[PDB]
Write a protein that binds this DNA or RNA. Sequence first.
DNA 1: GTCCGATCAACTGTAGTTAAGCTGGTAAGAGCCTGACCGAGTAGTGTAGTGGGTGACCATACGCGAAACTCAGGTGCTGCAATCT
Length: 224
Amino acid sequence: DLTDPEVPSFYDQVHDSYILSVSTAYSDFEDTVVSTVAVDGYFYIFNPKDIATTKTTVSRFRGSNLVPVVYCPQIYSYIYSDGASSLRAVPSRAAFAVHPLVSRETTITAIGVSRLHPMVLAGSADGSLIITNAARRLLHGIKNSSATQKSLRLWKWDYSIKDDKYRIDSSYEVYPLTVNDVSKAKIDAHGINITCTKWNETSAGGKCYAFSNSAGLLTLEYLS
DNA sequence: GTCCGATCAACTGTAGTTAAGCTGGTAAGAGCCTGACCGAGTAGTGTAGTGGGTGACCATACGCGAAACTCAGGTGCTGCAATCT
């Protein structure tokens, strides 16, 4: 309680080890459920009214030391990296309904989403930044999912061990949804991994986004 | 250590005891070589035990391949509805 910070309202065990990310799935029609992932790999959704009577599991991942999880409030779905190399959506009231959104050759390290639109931004540690419409997956039929949903690479960082440049590539690439795909882990230059990515969420700024690599090359674009 | 000089016998003048080998027929020393009898010497042997290394058989390990099982791709009609007519 930010007004009474001396003692917590509750202190209950929910994971075996380090809890990496916690996220709130707010709604005008359902309880404020909370999701959590940890180095033990479990993804749990629960209601803070009573954890013990409500705790539910979405998945167990391989133990991974950075797992981005965010809430897409336009479609009431959590958006998460599987700790390896796929982006997936899970509705807060149907945990079994896991839909994979995109596959990448290197781990998804940062994810961003906004309160005004369903556009999800995901950055992989290969320096690739991808955009995809999560609502097109969530609000439509299962049958033609392998062809009706696609993604676009907005930018790619690259680096040369001998030339020492950072080499931002503006060229757009379309990646279709490989549903049955393998997890992958291609190692890449230390500075070119994407450390954060977020859209501005005001109406005036709503087409603007910001992203960063780990060397320091913060980058912003207005999508017009 | 040495000094005097008495004194058994050293080294000095002639008067009287010792072999060697002849005639032999002979038994006496000093002896030789084969043989036998036990003690000791040369030395490989007779049980008996400690250690080691060889051989067989196993299972444990990874790594590549083989088939298993799960979960979701893909085929094709037609119940039902909508575009063109």
